[PDB]
């Protein structure tokens, strides 16, 4: 029939596949080479990026500098280790992102041994206002670069909560304070969201309207016993308990075979069985 399929062997001879990671939809190579390109007259001096990736459950933050062999990670700070600092639930908020961002800033400075001269801000009253690290004595702050990946940068995007935590942690990340949870309203709007204000106000609103709706949205919050009013102070201790111990943490891994390949002996034998039966049916 009238098909005219454009998939013939003549189509694939001229076909040119894209880059592998771009083919996967994970890497934007047009903006990557802008964040990789160190000045040529800086011979092999590392250029540092903050790889911020937010999954459905976990906020991943890494410090990576590019090399020809691959990308090397200087330090990583996940959000699933927040239960070690008192935050049991809500690992993907504007609040947990701030703690995940702050944890990496303190963890890296401790590893480099420069955490005594660079301390940032700590009090909760100054959580809402902008702060950029400055020169201490004559030593410049550690400088990084934000890598948001394939994430749209809105006016309240969580990827700027990770950035805000790092700056308050003592790490210099160049930025402008027009995309945090503020950029409108005032500092307290940003500061409250850093303390889970939007989550706390949700339950006290959802409970006011309905009960099954409140149970469906916050099922594990109710079971764990987390009151809506305790969110603000449960993150202050998380910020406190992070600054005094960000130094990471320490069996046999369990493997599961998946399919395994087929050798040429089995590959050739199967065709022979198929060929032999073809005459038996014929």
């Amino acid at each position: 029939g009238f098909l005219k399929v454009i998939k013939n062997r003549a189509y694939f001879k001229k076909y040119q596949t894209q880059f592998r990671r771009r083919r996967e939809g994970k890497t934007d190579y047009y903006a990557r080479r802008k964040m990789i390109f160190q000045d040529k007259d800086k011979f092999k001096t590392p250029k540092y990026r903050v790889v911020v990736r937010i999954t459905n459950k976990t906020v991943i933050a890494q410090i990576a500098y590019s090399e020809i062999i691959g990308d090397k990670i200087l330090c990583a700070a996940y959000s699933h280790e927040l239960p070690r600092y008192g935050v049991k639930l809500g690992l993907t908020n504007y609040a947990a992102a701030y703690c995940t961002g702050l944890l990496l800033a303190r963890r890296l400075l401790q590893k480099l041994g420069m955490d005594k001269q660079f301390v940032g801000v700590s009090d909760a009253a100054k959580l809402g206002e902008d702060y950029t690290p400055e020169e201490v004595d004559e030593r410049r702050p550690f400088k990084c670069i934000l890598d948001v990946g394939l994430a749209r940068t809105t006016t309240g995007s969580k990827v700027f909560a990770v950035l805000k935590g790092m700056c308050d942690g003592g790490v210099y990340v160049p930025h402008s304070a027009t995309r945090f949870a503020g950029a409108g309203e005032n500092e307290e709007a940003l500061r409250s969201r850093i303390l889970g204000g939007h989550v706390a106000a949700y339950m006290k609103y959802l409970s006011g309207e309905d009960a099954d709706l409140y149970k469906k949205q916050f099922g594990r919050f109710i079971a764990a016993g987390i009151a809506p009013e305790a969110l603000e102070n449960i993150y202050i201790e998380a910020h406190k308990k992070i600054r005094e111990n960000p130094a990471a943490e320490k069996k046999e891994h369990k493997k599961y075979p998946t399919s395994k390949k087929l050798t040429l002996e089995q590959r050739k034998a199967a065709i022979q069985a198929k060929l032999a039966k073809l005459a038996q049916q014929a």
């Binding site: 001229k14 040119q16 894209q18 047009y30 000045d39 040529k40 007259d41 092999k44």
Partner: protein, 165 residues
């Protein structure tokens, strides 16, 4: 009769390699060039800004200066009856690490390895090893014996002409 345009006669010279369009490698911008290295000028038509002249395509040059975004390249140009020095500033997207001294560089390593042993043998008293032999063209082959136990004979004669139709 041609025109005197800057990029004349580049229908095939400036065409991208087959199935080699789109973005270039990442190691192109990550390679670290240093003064004194050998490079090859390869005009990448995909980047129209700072594209070097078509006469320097394929020319091998020496890096003489490193700038924040461009790499200085110094090649030789041929003029009426003399040769002049051409100094260029080329972004890494158009140059390539030359491999002209690949054979030479490994010979230096072979000699430096032997010399390092000769300082481990003379003081300890052992006889010192000699340097590797120099390169020579293919010399005449020497005489040798061919065994008659694993040999076989095939006769060679002109072939009777057979038609292909």
């Amino acid at each position: 009769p041609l025109s005197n345009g800057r990029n004349r006669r580049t229908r095939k010279l400036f065409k991208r390699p087959f199935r080699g369009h789109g973005l270039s490698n990442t190691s192109t911008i990550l390679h670290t060039y240093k003064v004194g290295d050998y490079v090859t000028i390869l005009c990448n038509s995909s980047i129209q800004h700072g594209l070097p002249y078509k006469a320097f395509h394929g020319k091998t040059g020496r890096v003489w200066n490193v700038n924040p975004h461009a790499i200085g390249v110094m090649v030789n140009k041929k003029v009426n009856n003399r040769i002049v020095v051409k100094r260029l500033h080329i972004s890494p997207e158009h140059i390539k690490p030359s491999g002209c001294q690949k054979d030479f560089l490994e010979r230096k390593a072979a000699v430096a390895a032997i010399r390092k042993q000769n300082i481990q043998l003379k003081k300890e008293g052992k006889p010192l090893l000699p340097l590797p032999a120099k390169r020579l063209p293919k010399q005449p082959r020497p005489a040798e014996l061919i065994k008659g136990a694993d040999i076989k004979f095939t006769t060679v004669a002109p072939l009777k002409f057979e038609e292909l139709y």
